[PDB]
Tab-separated table of C-alpha atoms in Angstrom:
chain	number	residue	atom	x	y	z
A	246	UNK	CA	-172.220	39.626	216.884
A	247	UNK	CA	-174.954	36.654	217.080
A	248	UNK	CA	-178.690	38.632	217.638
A	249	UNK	CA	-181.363	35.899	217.818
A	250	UNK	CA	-183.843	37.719	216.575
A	251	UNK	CA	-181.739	38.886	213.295
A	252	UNK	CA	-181.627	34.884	212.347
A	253	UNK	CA	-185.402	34.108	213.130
A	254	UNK	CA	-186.053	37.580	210.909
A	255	UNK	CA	-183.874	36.797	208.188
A	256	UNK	CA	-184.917	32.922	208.416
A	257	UNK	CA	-188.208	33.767	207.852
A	258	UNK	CA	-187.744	36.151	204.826
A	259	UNK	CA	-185.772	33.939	203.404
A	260	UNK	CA	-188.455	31.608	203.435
A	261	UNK	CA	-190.756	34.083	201.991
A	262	UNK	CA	-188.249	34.982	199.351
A	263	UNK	CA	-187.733	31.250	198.041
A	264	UNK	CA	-191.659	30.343	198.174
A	265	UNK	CA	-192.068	33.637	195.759
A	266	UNK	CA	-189.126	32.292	193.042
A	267	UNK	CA	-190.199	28.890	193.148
A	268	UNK	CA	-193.483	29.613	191.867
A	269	UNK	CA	-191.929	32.442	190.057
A	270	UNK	CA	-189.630	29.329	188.445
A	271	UNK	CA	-191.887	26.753	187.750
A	272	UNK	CA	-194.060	29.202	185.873
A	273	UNK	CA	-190.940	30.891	183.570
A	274	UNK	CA	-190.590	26.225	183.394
A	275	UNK	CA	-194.168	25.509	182.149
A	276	UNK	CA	-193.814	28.029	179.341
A	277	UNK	CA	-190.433	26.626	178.373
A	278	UNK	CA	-191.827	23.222	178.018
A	279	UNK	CA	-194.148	24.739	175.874
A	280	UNK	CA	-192.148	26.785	173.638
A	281	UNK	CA	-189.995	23.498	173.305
A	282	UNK	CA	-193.184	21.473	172.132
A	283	UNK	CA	-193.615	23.597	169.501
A	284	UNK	CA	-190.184	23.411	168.044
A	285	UNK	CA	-190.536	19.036	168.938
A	286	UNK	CA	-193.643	19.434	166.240
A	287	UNK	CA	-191.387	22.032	163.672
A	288	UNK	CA	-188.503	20.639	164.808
A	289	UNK	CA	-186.347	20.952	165.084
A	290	UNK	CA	-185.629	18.464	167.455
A	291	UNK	CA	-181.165	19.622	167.956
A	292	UNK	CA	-182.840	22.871	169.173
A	293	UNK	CA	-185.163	20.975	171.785
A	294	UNK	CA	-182.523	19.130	172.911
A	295	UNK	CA	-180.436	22.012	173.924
A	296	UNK	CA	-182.968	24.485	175.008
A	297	UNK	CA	-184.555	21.380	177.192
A	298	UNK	CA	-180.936	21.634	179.123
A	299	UNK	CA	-181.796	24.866	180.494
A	300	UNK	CA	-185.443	23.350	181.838
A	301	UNK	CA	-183.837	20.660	183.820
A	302	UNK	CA	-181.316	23.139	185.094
A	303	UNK	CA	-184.333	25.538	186.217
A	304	UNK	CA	-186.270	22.208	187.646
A	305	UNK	CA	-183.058	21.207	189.739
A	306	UNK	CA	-182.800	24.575	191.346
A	307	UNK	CA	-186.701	24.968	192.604
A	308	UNK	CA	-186.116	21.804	194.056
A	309	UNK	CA	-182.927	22.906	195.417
A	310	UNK	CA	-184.881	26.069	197.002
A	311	UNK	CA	-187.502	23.734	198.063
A	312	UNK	CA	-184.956	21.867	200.268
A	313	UNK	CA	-183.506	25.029	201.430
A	314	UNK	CA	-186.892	25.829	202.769
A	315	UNK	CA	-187.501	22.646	204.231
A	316	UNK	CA	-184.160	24.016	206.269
A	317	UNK	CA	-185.239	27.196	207.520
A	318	UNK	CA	-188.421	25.481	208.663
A	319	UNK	CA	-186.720	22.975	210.889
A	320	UNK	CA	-184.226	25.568	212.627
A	321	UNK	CA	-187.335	27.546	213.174
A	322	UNK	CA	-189.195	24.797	214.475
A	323	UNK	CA	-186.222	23.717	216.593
A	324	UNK	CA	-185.240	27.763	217.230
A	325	UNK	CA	-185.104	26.876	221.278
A	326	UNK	CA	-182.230	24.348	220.537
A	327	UNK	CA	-180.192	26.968	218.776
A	328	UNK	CA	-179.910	29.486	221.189
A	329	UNK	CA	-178.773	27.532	223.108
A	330	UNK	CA	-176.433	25.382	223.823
A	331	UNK	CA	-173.763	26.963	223.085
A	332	UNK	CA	-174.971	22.403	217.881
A	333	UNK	CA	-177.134	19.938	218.242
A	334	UNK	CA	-176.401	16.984	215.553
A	335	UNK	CA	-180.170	17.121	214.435
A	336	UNK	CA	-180.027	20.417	213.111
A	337	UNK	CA	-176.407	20.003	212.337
A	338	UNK	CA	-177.253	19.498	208.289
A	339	UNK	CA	-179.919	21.793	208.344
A	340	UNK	CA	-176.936	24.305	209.417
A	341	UNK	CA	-174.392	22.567	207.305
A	342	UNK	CA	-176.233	23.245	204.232
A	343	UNK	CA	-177.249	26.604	204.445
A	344	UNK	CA	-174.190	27.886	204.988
A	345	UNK	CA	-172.965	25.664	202.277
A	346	UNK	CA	-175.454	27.049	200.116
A	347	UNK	CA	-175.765	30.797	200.863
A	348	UNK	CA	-172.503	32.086	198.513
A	349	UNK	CA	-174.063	29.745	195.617
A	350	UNK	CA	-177.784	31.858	195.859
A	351	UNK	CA	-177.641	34.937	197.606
A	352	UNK	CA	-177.338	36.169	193.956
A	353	UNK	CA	-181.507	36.219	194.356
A	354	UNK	CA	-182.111	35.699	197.781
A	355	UNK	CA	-180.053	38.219	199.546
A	356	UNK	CA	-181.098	37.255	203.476
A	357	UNK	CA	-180.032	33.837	203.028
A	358	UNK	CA	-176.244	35.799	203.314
A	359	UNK	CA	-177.706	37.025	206.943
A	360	UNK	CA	-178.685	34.182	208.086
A	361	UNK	CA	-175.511	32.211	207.171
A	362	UNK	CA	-173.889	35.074	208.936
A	363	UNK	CA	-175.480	34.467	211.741
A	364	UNK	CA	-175.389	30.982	211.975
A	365	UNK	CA	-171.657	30.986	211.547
A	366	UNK	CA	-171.498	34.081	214.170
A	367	UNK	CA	-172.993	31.523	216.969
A	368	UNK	CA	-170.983	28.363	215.613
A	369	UNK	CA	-167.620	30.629	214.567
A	370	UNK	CA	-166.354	30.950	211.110
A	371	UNK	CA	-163.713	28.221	211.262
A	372	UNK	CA	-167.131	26.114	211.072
A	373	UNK	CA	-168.000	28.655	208.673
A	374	UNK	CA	-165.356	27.391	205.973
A	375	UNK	CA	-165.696	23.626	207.173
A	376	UNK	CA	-169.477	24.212	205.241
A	377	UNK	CA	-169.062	26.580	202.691
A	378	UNK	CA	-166.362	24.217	200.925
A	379	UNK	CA	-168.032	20.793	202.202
A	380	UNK	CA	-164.746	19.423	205.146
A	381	UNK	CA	-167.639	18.820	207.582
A	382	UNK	CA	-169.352	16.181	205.187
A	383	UNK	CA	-172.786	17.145	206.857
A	384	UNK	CA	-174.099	19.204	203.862
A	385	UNK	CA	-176.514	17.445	202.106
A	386	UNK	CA	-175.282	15.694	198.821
A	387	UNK	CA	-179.062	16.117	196.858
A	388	UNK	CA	-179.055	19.799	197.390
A	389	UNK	CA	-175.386	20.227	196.092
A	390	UNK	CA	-175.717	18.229	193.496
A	391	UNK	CA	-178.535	20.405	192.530
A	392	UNK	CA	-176.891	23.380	192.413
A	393	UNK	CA	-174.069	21.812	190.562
A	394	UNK	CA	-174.129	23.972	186.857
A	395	UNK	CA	-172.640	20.835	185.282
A	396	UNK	CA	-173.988	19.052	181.819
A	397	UNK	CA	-177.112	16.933	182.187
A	398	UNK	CA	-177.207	12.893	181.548
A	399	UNK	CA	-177.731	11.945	177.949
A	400	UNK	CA	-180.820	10.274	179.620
A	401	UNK	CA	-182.086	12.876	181.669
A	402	UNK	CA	-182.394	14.886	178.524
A	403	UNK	CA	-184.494	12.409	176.133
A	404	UNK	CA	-186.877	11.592	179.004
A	405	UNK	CA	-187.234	15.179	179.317
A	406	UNK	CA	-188.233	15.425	175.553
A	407	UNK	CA	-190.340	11.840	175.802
A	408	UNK	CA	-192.226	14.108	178.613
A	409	UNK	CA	-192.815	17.289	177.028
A	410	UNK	CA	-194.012	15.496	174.042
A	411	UNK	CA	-196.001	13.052	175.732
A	412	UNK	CA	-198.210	16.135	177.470
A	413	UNK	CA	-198.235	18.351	174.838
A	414	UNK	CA	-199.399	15.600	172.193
A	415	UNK	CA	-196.148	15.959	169.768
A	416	UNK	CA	-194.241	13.451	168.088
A	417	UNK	CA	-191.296	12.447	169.587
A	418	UNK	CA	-187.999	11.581	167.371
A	419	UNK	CA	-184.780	9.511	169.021
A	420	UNK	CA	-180.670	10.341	168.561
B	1271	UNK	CA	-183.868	-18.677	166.451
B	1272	UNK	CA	-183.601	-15.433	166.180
B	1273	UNK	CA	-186.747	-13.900	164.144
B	1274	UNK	CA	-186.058	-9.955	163.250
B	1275	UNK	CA	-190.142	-9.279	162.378
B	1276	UNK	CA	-190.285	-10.911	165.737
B	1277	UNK	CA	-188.008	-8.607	167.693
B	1278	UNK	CA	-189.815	-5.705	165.751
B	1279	UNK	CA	-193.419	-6.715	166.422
B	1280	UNK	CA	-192.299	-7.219	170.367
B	1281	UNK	CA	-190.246	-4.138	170.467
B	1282	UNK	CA	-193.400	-2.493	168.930
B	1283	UNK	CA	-195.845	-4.093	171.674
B	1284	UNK	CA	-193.896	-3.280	174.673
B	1285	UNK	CA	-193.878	0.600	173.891
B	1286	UNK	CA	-197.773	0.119	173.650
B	1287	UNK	CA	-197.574	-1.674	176.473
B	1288	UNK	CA	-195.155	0.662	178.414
B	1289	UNK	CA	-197.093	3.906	177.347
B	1290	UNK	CA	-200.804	2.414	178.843
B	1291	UNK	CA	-198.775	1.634	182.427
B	1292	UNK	CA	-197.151	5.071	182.380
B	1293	UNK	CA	-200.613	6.367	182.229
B	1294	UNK	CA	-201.994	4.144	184.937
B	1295	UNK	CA	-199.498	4.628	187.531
B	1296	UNK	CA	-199.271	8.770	186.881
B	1297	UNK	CA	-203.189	8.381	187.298
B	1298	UNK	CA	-202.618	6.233	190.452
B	1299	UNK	CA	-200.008	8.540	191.685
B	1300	UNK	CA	-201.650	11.783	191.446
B	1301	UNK	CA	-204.840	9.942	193.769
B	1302	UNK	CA	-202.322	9.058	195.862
B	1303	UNK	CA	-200.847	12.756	196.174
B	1304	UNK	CA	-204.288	13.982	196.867
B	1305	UNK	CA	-205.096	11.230	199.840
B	1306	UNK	CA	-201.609	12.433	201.161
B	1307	UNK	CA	-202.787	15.841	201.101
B	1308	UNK	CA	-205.856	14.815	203.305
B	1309	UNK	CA	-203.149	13.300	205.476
B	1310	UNK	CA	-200.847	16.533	205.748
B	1311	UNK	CA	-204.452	18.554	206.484
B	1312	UNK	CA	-205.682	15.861	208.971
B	1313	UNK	CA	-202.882	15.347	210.500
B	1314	UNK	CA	-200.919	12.442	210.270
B	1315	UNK	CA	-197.654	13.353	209.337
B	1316	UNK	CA	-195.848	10.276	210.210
B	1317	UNK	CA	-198.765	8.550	207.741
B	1318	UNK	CA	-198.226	10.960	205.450
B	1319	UNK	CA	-193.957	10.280	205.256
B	1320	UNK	CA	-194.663	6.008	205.080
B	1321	UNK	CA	-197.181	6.119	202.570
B	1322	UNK	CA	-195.809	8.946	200.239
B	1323	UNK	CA	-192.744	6.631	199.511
B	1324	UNK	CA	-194.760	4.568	197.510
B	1325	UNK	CA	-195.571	7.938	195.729
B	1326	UNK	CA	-191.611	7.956	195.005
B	1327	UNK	CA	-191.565	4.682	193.874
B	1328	UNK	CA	-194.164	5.005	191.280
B	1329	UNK	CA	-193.025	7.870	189.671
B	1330	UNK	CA	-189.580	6.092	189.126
B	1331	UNK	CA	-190.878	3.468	188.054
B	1332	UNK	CA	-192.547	5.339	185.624
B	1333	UNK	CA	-189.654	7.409	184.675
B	1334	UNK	CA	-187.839	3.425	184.067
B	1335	UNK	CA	-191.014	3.032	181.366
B	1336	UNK	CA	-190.325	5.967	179.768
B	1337	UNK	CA	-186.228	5.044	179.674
B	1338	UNK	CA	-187.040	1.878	178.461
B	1339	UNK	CA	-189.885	2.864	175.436
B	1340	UNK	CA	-186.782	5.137	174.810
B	1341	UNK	CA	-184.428	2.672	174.108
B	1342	UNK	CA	-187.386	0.435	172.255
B	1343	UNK	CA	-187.820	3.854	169.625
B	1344	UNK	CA	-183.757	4.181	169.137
B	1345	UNK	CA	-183.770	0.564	168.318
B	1346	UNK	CA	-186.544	0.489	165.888
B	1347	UNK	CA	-185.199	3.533	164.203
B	1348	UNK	CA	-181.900	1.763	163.616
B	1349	UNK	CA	-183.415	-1.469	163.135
B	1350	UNK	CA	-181.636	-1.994	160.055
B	1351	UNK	CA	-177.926	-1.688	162.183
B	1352	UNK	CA	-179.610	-4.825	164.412
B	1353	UNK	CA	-179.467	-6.941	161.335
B	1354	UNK	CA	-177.048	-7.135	160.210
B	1355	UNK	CA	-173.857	-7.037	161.506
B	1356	UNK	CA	-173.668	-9.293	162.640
B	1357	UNK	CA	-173.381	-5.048	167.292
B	1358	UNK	CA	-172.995	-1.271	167.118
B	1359	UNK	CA	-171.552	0.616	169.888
B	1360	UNK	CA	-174.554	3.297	169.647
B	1361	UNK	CA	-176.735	0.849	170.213
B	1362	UNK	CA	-175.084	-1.215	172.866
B	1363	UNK	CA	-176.599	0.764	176.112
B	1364	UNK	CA	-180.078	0.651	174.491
B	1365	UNK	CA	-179.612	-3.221	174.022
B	1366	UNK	CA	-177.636	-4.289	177.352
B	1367	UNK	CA	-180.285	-2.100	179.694
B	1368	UNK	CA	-183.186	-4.205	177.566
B	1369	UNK	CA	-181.777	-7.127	178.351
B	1370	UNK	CA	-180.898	-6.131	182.266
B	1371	UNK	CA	-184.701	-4.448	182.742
B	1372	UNK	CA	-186.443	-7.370	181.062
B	1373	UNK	CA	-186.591	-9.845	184.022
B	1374	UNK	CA	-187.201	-7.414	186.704
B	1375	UNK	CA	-190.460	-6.062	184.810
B	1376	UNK	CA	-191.469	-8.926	182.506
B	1377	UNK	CA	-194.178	-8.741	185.846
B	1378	UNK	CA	-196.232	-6.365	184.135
B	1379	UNK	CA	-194.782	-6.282	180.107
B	1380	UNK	CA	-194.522	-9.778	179.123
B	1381	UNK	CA	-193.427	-9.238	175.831
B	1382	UNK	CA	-190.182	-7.494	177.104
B	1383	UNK	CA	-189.427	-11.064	177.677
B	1384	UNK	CA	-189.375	-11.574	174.140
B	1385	UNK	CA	-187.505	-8.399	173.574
B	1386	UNK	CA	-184.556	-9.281	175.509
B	1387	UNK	CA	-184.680	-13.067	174.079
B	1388	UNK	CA	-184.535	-12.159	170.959
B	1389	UNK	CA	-181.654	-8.877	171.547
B	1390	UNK	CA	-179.807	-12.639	172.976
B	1391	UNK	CA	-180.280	-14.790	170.283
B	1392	UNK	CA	-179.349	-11.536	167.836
B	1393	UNK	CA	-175.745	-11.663	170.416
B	1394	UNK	CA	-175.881	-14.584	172.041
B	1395	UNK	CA	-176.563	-15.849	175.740
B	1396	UNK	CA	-173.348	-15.132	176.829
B	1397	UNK	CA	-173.817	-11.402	176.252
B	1398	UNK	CA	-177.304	-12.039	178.082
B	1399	UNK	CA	-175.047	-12.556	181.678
B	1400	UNK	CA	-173.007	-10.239	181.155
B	1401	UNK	CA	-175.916	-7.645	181.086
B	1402	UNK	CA	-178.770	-9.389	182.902
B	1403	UNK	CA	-175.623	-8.581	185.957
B	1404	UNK	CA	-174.164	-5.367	184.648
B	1405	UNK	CA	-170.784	-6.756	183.899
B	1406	UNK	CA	-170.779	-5.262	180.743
B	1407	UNK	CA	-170.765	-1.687	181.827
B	1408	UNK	CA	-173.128	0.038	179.469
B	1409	UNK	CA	-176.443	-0.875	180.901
B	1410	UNK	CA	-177.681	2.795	181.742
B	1411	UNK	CA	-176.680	3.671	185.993
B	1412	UNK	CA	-179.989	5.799	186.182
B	1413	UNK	CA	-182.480	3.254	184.697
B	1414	UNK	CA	-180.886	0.693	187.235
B	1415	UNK	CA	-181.102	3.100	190.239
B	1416	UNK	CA	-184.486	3.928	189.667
B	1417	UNK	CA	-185.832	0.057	189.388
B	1418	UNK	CA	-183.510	-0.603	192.554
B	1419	UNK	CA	-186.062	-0.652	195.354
B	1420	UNK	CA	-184.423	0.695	198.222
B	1421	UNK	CA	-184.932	3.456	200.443
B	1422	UNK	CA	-185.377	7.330	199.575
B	1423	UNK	CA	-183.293	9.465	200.545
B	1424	UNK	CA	-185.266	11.729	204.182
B	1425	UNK	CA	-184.378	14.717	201.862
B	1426	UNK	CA	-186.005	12.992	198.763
B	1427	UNK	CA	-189.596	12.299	200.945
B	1428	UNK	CA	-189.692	16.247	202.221
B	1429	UNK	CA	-189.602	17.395	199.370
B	1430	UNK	CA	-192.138	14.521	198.034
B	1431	UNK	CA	-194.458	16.534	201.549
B	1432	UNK	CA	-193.300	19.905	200.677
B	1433	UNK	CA	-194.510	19.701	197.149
B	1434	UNK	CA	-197.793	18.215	198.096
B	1435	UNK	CA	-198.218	20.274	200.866
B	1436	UNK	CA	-197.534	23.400	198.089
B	1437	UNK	CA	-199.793	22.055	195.567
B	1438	UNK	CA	-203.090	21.031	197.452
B	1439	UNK	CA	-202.570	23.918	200.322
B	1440	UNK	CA	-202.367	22.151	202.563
B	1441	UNK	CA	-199.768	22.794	206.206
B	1442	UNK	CA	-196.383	21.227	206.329
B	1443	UNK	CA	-195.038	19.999	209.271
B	1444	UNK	CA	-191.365	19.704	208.942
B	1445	UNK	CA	-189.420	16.646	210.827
């Protein structure tokens, strides 16, 4: 049961939904990276370089909403194309992805379920499965890899701390 | 001729040097994000995606600089492991991605010349090769991706207009 209007609804609360955690994110961020200065100046510097770990993993995701976003923006923009025929190839990521990503977040943004719902109700669920576990190899590699809850590079990590310490005026110790 | 309070003293002038570019190009950068902005209001949206690759560029490039003054602090911290013997396998990726970095930025930090000459007369030239061309395997993947100047990712610059577009409230137009 495909309604147009239930995507382009559920689309655009979506949207609403992820602009409100991003900033919601990137503030609950900026006072992480503080409270993680002040244990690089105790410090306390094993406890930094854990509780960093969660930062980056916070930092991965608002980007990963961001690109989500970027998604419902340009099926919105290209709504005429949807409906229809009958999937066009230009929105065929855009599609891809969401689905892909909608069982991953709908944890905080519920309509992003709806609106993989629908788009798998006017493209079938046998796409539906060819996204959610990536056969279709049109989901976007960047956003998956941002949702992937696996360890962070050495690197990545040290870098983070050079940052942090770096903007908040703390010294800085190496592994 | 390998001269450790030379190694030291360049080791010691390159994170100066390194710390006074990362400053410049963030300063550059965030100019750069503003005239964007004026781009995204005006606008100018196929401007806007050219010119805010450059954008991309410079902040890996200054994410390289902080990798790098990085692996300049873990090396001065053990700079009694450098000599002698005789090298140690902790140090190994901060010494191989030296020596691979140091003619691709020597441009801007001379004395990273020195760095790496020194790291090769400390382990000889024939270790120089073999990182100069990762053939060694421990020069560090993300410092080499983010000095390799290719072409970002369309996700990567939407993102780079989203962002902007967020920050300076400006409209975003998607693709």
């Amino acid at each position: 049961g495909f309604k147009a209007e239930r995507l382009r609804v559920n689309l655009r609360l979506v949207i609403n939904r992820l602009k409100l955690l991003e900033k919601k994110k990137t503030e609950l961020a900026q006072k992480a990276r503080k409270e993680i200065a002040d244990y690089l100046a105790a410090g306390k510097d094993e406890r930094a370089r854990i509780r960093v770990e969660h930062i980056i993993r916070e930092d991965y995701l608002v980007e990963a909403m961001e690109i989500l976003e970027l998604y419902c923006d340009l099926l919105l923009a290209r709504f005429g194309l949807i409906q229809s025929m009958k999937l066009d190839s230009g929105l065929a990521e855009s599609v891809s992805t969401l689905i892909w990503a909608a069982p991953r977040l709908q944890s905080e943004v519920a309509e992003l379920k709806i609106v993989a719902d629908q788009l798998c109700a006017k493209y079938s669920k046998e796409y539906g499965k060819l996204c959610r576990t990536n056969q279709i190899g049109t989901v976007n590699d960047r956003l998956m890899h941002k949702l992937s809850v696996e360890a962070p590079p050495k690197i990545l990590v040290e870098r983070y701390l050079i940052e942090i310490a770096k903007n908040y005026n703390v010294p800085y110790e190496p592994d």
